[PDB]
Ligand binder design. Structure first.
Ligand code: K
Ligand code: K
Ligand code: K
Ligand code: K
Ligand code: K
Ligand code: K
Ligand code: K
Ligand code: K
Ligand code: K
Ligand code: K
Ligand code: K
Ligand code: K
Ligand code: K
Ligand code: K
Ligand code: K
Ligand code: K
Ligand code: K
Ligand code: K
Ligand code: K
Ligand code: K
Ligand code: K
Ligand code: K
Ligand code: K
Ligand code: K
Ligand code: K
Ligand code: K
Ligand code: K
Ligand code: K
Ligand code: MG
Ligand code: MG
Ligand code: MG
Ligand code: MG
Ligand code: MG
Ligand code: MG
Ligand code: MG
Ligand code: MG
Ligand code: MG
Ligand code: MG
Ligand code: MG
Ligand code: MG
Ligand code: MG
Ligand code: MG
Ligand code: MG
Ligand code: MG
Ligand code: MG
Ligand code: MG
Ligand code: MG
Ligand code: MG
Ligand code: MG
Ligand code: MG
Ligand code: MG
Ligand code: MG
Ligand code: MG
Ligand code: MG
Ligand code: MG
Ligand code: MG
Ligand code: MG
Ligand code: MG
Ligand code: MG
Ligand code: MG
Ligand code: MG
Ligand code: MG
Ligand code: MG
Ligand code: MG
Ligand code: MG
Ligand code: MG
Ligand code: MG
Ligand code: MG
Ligand code: MG
Ligand code: MG
Ligand code: MG
Ligand code: MG
Ligand code: MG
Ligand code: MG
Ligand code: MG
Ligand code: MG
Ligand code: MG
Ligand code: MG
Ligand code: MG
Ligand code: MG
Ligand code: MG
Ligand code: MG
Ligand code: MG
Ligand code: MG
Ligand code: MG
Ligand code: MG
Ligand code: MG
Ligand code: MG
Ligand code: MG
Ligand code: MG
Ligand code: MG
Ligand code: MG
Ligand code: MG
Ligand code: MG
Ligand code: MG
Ligand code: MG
Ligand code: MG
Ligand code: MG
Ligand code: MG
Ligand code: MG
Ligand code: MG
Ligand code: MG
Ligand code: MG
Ligand code: MG
Ligand code: MG
Ligand code: MG
Ligand code: MG
Ligand code: MG
Ligand code: MG
Ligand code: MG
Ligand code: MG
Ligand code: MG
Ligand code: MG
Ligand code: MG
Ligand code: MG
Ligand code: MG
Ligand code: MG
Ligand code: MG
Ligand code: MG
Ligand code: MG
Ligand code: MG
Ligand code: MG
Ligand code: MG
Ligand code: MG
Ligand code: MG
Ligand code: MG
Ligand code: MG
Ligand code: MG
Ligand code: MG
Ligand code: MG
Ligand code: MG
Ligand code: MG
Ligand code: MG
Ligand code: MG
Ligand code: MG
Ligand code: MG
Ligand code: MG
Ligand code: MG
Ligand code: MG
Ligand code: MG
Ligand code: MG
Ligand code: MG
Ligand code: MG
Lengths: 71, 95, 96
RNA sequence: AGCCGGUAGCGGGCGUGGAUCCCUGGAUGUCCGAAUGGGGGAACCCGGCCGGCGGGAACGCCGGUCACCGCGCUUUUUGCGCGGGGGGAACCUGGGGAACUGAAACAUCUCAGUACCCAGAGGAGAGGAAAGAGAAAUCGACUCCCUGAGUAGCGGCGAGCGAAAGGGGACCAGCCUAAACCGUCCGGCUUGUCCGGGCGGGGUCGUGGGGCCCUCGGACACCGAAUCCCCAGCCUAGCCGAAGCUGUUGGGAAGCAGCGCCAGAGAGGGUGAAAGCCCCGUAGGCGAAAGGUGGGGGGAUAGGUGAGGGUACCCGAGUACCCCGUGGUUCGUGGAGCCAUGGGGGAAUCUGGGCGGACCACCGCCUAAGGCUAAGUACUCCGGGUGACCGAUAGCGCACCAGUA
RNA sequence: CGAAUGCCGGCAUGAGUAACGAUAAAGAGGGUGAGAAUCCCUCUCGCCGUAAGCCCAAGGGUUCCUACGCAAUGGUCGUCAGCGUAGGGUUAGGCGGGACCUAAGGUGAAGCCGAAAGGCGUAGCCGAAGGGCAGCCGGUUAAUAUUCCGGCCCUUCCCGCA
RNA sequence: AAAUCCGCCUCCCAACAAGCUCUGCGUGGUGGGGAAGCCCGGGUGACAACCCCCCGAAGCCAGGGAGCCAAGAAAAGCCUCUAAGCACAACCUGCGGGAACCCGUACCGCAAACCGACACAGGUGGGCGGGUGCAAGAGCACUCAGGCGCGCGGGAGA
């Protein structure tokens, strides 16, 4: 995972805020249904709830990076 | 980011909730500070389905003394929502 | 403010009331004694000075000792504008 | 080279393409709290405005913005701008200010300017370049220590209270201004060589100094910050770091034995028991991109310096001064001055003024009524070191999820 | 350290003693269970009934319902529980309060006063068991219902038309 | 300030009223409910019937009325009146469609769940509180509904 989150990180950099805004609006849904599979009873060998929130977090800061100096 | 997938948290899983699926009455755990009007739209975009009447209520967690350390379970709010007759929140229809 | 002079800053001080029984030793007077010593406030002699400056009337609470300082401040005249709170200007910014 | 906290387990994952972890910075930071849009029974409730989102006008959500005060700007604030709110263990200054107690009763007195209340400041605060001391033609800003000294004195001369000069030390630097005359901008006007407020120049001293004239030739050579700038150094993570094996007893060796070795390291802790050489250390050396510091080294910047003559222009006001009421000082009214100050009266600008303990002369010392100034000093919420400091009734109330039950 | 009606702690004595908290009262059969006077069921007996019943408010804050439990809590016992563990359970435009109103009182621009802290204060604002305001009858659940459902019936806003 | 409103004077009609409005009750389309006893909280009783009298409130019509003296809240909602402003707005009425948020809602609640350290004979505000008899009544006695026999017992009979 380390190797590709390295990619996935610099990947999402320089990628317009509106699609950063759009991508996360999907990932939060990906988490939403993820909570259900886990809640309904062990339809989740989970370990993903974490690194998906960590994905969602990771994005929102790069959304924020662009929105610091000059958009 | 404030998204509909943040208001609705988990399905309410109990026999009482199941006898609600008879009519269009599906019930979920929501975020405690979420208002009826922002739950309507929360469902409407999270399940592509029309919302007719939202009913909410708060639930205080229970004081549980796990081995002489006594604390409280987090407070939940939940809501039962009327889907326009005919429509079905399909993914919640399992069991 | 509170029983203070707007112009001199003089404010009530604390003094002692000293009661004395006896003849002054400087009079064949075996001695002066003291029967009581208690606390008292001395209050500055405050008075109202009500002056019509350019627009409206201006009311001061000055120590009677510094009363003419008002009328010497009344001398400085320019800026014939806003409300009865001109003293803001007549005050320390005159003297500063 | 392991990691996914105390914490195992279930159920899953990450790591030599350097994880976990530690240091620096940055981002996110619901609600409450000075709490600051408005309310409010802290952590809840209700809005205005601009933009957004949903079918979105009503409803709702989201981002942003809107308290009050002071001050400078300006068109009377219709606006903008910077600043202030509150917290902090103790230390600090100011404003207030007890009593028990002692006096073997008690009232002056004491306890004491203490405890405490309030306001302000900061990493220190206060104070600080003499209207000073006080007898030596004498010291030279202030703070602190030591001494002077339990002296001088104060005192129901009771109990008690208690200086200073000087001397030895720590540290050590002094600087802006108001006023005269010059320029000026706007002002007001009974237009003028006038007054005046805002600014610039000038100028800051007690052997007196300055201003304006007069003569001189004065000089940038020298001086140089407490302001800014760079740097070494330090703090916020770390790193390297000598020298032993074997045999015995023994659950276990570090014990005992045989032969060795290091030592700028024989401080300590740990290892199944007693180890310089097994591990962690120690002596000795190393180490910063980034944040804070930088009182030391370097550099710039402000800023600063003439002589003599004449003129008498200026040298901090309801102040000095005097009287009534008091505080401070060792001073309790005492021969009671000095420094403060509530009340009354009320000056002068060198031939002017305050002081040398009433008052007078003489002889002297100082320049009041405007302001800032590092360092030497105080404390310890915090980090580290050290102990003829405690060892679970002790040591902080708390060695343990305690300001808890 | 033996003494301070010392201090903290532990254990004795009284003593198998007094008490077991209203004199409204019990009896039996049956069942569950390791174990039953005490738990469940039936029948007979007694007691409250302007109540010892029923409904709101305050206060209490999960004690409510169900399963599994008996160390301890219950003045005995306990298989029971208001107790231990766990799961579930509170649904509102019309009921209550808030996006309404004012009362005493509180706070408070203007203003006044006070060594400081602060004290007052017309307006305004806060403030309710008073004013205002639109829901009645049934059914349903182990546990919620003027709340979900059934039927009939109304209130506000916004936008349209007449 | 301005009002067509309110107040004050004047004629007019009206009138111990009607009418216009507003409540309450009765009826109302229709919708509910529906015992005893009987068979294991639940079926059936049932297609239950659902009617006539009488007693009758302190409660409703309610701002009713008469007396009395001690002389008996306020503000908004509501109607009206107009000022700025605007009259292609705005408001009223009627029909339509859409919108209607936050918080409480469990259970105890004269008590073993509140205050009393206790499962404490104490204390705690408002409404309902049926039947018979007794002069009346919320009194007293018994009893509906519903709730209980007070969380130590067994004997003995100084
Ligand atoms: K006067
Ligand atoms: K590296
Ligand atoms: K807002
Ligand atoms: K003080
Ligand atoms: K005394
Ligand atoms: K005595
Ligand atoms: K005495
Ligand atoms: K003293
Ligand atoms: K100057
Ligand atoms: K001039
Ligand atoms: K050493
Ligand atoms: K050792
Ligand atoms: K002169
Ligand atoms: K004196
Ligand atoms: K003086
Ligand atoms: K002197
Ligand atoms: K002197
Ligand atoms: K200072
Ligand atoms: K102990
Ligand atoms: K202790
Ligand atoms: K005994
Ligand atoms: K009865
Ligand atoms: K038991
Ligand atoms: K008042
Ligand atoms: K109310
Ligand atoms: K009717
Ligand atoms: K309820
Ligand atoms: K009840
Ligand atoms: Mg990561
Ligand atoms: Mg966020
Ligand atoms: Mg609700
Ligand atoms: Mg006197
Ligand atoms: Mg006295
Ligand atoms: Mg005294
Ligand atoms: Mg005078
Ligand atoms: Mg006078
Ligand atoms: Mg595992
Ligand atoms: Mg950080
Ligand atoms: Mg949130
Ligand atoms: Mg507030
Ligand atoms: Mg607020
Ligand atoms: Mg309100
Ligand atoms: Mg908007
Ligand atoms: Mg739109
Ligand atoms: Mg907002
Ligand atoms: Mg906002
Ligand atoms: Mg802001
Ligand atoms: Mg402060
Ligand atoms: Mg304060
Ligand atoms: Mg501060
Ligand atoms: Mg003081
Ligand atoms: Mg003060
Ligand atoms: Mg005595
Ligand atoms: Mg200092
Ligand atoms: Mg001497
Ligand atoms: Mg001394
Ligand atoms: Mg010197
Ligand atoms: Mg000048
Ligand atoms: Mg100059
Ligand atoms: Mg001269
Ligand atoms: Mg090493
Ligand atoms: Mg080594
Ligand atoms: Mg052996
Ligand atoms: Mg060995
Ligand atoms: Mg030996
Ligand atoms: Mg050792
Ligand atoms: Mg040894
Ligand atoms: Mg070293
Ligand atoms: Mg650096
Ligand atoms: Mg330097
Ligand atoms: Mg230097
Ligand atoms: Mg002078
Ligand atoms: Mg004195
Ligand atoms: Mg004196
Ligand atoms: Mg004098
Ligand atoms: Mg003298
Ligand atoms: Mg003398
Ligand atoms: Mg001076
Ligand atoms: Mg100072
Ligand atoms: Mg010891
Ligand atoms: Mg020891
Ligand atoms: Mg202890
Ligand atoms: Mg011990
Ligand atoms: Mg803690
Ligand atoms: Mg003893
Ligand atoms: Mg003993
Ligand atoms: Mg005894
Ligand atoms: Mg005795
Ligand atoms: Mg006995
Ligand atoms: Mg006996
Ligand atoms: Mg007995
Ligand atoms: Mg059996
Ligand atoms: Mg029995
Ligand atoms: Mg009876
Ligand atoms: Mg009962
Ligand atoms: Mg009830
Ligand atoms: Mg309640
Ligand atoms: Mg309780
Ligand atoms: Mg419990
Ligand atoms: Mg059971
Ligand atoms: Mg027991
Ligand atoms: Mg129960
Ligand atoms: Mg239980
Ligand atoms: Mg409704
Ligand atoms: Mg309705
Ligand atoms: Mg609203
Ligand atoms: Mg209100
Ligand atoms: Mg109001
Ligand atoms: Mg007040
Ligand atoms: Mg009401
Ligand atoms: Mg209502
Ligand atoms: Mg109705
Ligand atoms: Mg009902
Ligand atoms: Mg119930
Ligand atoms: Mg309904
Ligand atoms: Mg008029
Ligand atoms: Mg009717
Ligand atoms: Mg039938
Ligand atoms: Mg009749
Ligand atoms: Mg009748
Ligand atoms: Mg009545
Ligand atoms: Mg009544
Ligand atoms: Mg009436
Ligand atoms: Mg009447
Ligand atoms: Mg009002
Ligand atoms: Mg409508
Ligand atoms: Mg209920
Ligand atoms: Mg009772
Ligand atoms: Mg009652
Ligand atoms: Mg009960
Ligand atoms: Mg008691
Ligand atoms: Mg109790
Ligand atoms: Mg209790
Ligand atoms: Mg009992
Ligand atoms: Mg009781
Ligand atoms: Mg009572
Ligand atoms: Mg009755
Ligand atoms: Mg009778
Ligand atoms: Mg009755
Ligand atoms: Mg009766
Ligand atoms: Mg009775
Ligand atoms: Mg019965
Ligand atoms: Mg009993």
């Amino acid at each position: 995972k380390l190797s590709e989150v390295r990619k996935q990180l610099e990947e999402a950099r320089k990628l317009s805020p509106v699609e950063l805004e759009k991508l996360v609006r999907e990932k939060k849904r990906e988490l939403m249904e993820l909570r259900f599979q886990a809640s309904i009873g062990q339809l989740s060998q989970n370990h993903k709830i974490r690194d998906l929130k960590r994905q969602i977090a990771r994005l929102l800061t790069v959304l924020n990076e662009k929105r610091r100096q000059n958009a | 980011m404030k998204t509909a997938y943040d208001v609705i948290l988990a399905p309410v899983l109990s026999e009482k909730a199941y006898a609600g699926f008879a009519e269009g009455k599906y019930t979920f755990w929501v975020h405690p500070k979420a208002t009826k009007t922002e739950i309507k739209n929360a469902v409407e975009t999270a399940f592509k389905v029309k919302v007719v009447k939202v009913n909410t209520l708060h639930v205080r967690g229970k004081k549980k003394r796990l081995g002489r350390y006594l604390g409280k379970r987090p407070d939940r709010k939940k809501a039962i929502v009327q889907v326009a007759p005919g429509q079905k929140i399909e993914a919640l229809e399992g069991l | 403010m509170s029983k203070v002079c707007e112009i001199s800053g003089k404010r009530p001080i604390v003094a002692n009331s000293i009661q004395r029984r006896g003849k002054a030793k400087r009079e064949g007077g075996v001695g002066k004694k003291t029967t009581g010593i208690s606390k008292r406030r001395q209050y500055p002699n405050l008075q109202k000075v009500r002056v019509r400056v350019a627009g409206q009337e201006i009311t001061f609470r000055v120590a009677a000792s510094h009363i003419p300082k008002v009328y010497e401040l009344v001398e400085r005249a320019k800026g014939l504008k806003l409300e009865g709170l001109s003293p803001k200007e007549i005050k320390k910014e005159l003297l500063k």
